[PDB]
């Protein structure tokens, strides 16, 4: 690595990250292999990005959403609850500060932690609706891994919304503490509590 100088000097940090392999500011996109063999081909890896902002043509066809990175799936999941619509630069500021918090505590790669959290908190089976006539009944069958990850990101998103709502605690660390709790397993956060609630609901109506 040799620093290259031009008519307008630039900080050496970006040049260092641009020398061998492109990454985030200090974070690396490698060593994030998924432990679950059922979630492959659905999470996007090995194609690093700098900022979660991207205007991709992912909503045109059926499965163009498969190549959507995990990180902005959280930011896109945060893009609701009314007045929070828009200003996606806030939606990318929250995640960057969230992974920054996970950097100091549990010094492993935060993006590998949220991937592990997605695998852990992803529900595997769920119940359906059956007419019956007069009364409604629920039948339980399996859930596709595409729906597994899509529901998994949402559970963290609306599990930290009310946790940081009407409280001094901000949403910067509320997402941070929720994802580590789901990853390691604590049975205290909203995501795990809802995951076992539907597991026992499906178990009862198996």
């Amino acid at each position: 690595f040799t620093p290259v100088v031009l008519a307008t000097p630039i900080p050496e940090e970006v040049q260092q990250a641009q020398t061998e392999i492109k990454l985030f500011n200090k974070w690396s996109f490698e060593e994030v292999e998924v432990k679950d063999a059922s979630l492959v081909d659905y999470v996007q890896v090995r194609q690093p990005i700098f900022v979660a902002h991207t205007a991709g043509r992912y909503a045109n066809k059926r499965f163009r959403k498969a190549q959507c990175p995990i990180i902005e799936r959280l930011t896109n999941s945060l893009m609701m609850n009314g007045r929070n619509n828009g200003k996606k630069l806030k939606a990318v500021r929250i995640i960057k500060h969230t992974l920054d918090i996970i950097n100091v505590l549990t010094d492993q790669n935060p993006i590998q932690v949220v991937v592990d959290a997605i695998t852990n908190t992803g529900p595997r089976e769920d119940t359906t609706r059956v007419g019956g006539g007069g009364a409604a009944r629920r039948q339980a069958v399996d859930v596709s891994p595409l729906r597994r990850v899509n529901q998994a990101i949402a559970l963290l998103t609306i599990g930290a919304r009310e946790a940081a709502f009407r409280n001094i605690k901000t949403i910067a660390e509320t997402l941070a503490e929720e994802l580590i709790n789901a990853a390691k397993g604590s049975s205290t956060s909203y995501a795990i509590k809802k995951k076992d609630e539907l597991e026992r609901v499906a178990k009862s109506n198996r």
């Binding site: 500021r93 500060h97 918090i101 100091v104 605690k169 910067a172």
Partner: protein, 77 residues
């Protein structure tokens, strides 16, 4: 039930009887930030920023990365 709240008492003006313990109780903390100071040290968010700046003046902690209404910190290790 919606009973009466606890009326949280985050500190807004420092004083010696409570200024002294920050240098002795904050240690042995792996992850530190502004938010943890508010809900655990019972101090204000603005008070946390100046106190951490004063505490980092002693060459123990460093901002590392910081921005508006957020910061990350880690004790001497």
């Amino acid at each position: 039930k919606k009973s009466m709240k606890d009326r949280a008492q985050h500190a807004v003006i420092l004083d010696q009887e409570k200024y002294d313990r920050i240098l002795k109780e904050v240690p042995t903390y792996r992850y530190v930030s502004v938010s943890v100071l508010v809900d655990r040290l019972k101090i204000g968010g603005s008070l946390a920023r100046i106190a951490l700046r004063h505490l980092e003046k002693e060459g123990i902690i460093k901002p590392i990365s910081k921005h508006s209404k957020q910061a990350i910190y880690t004790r001497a290790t």
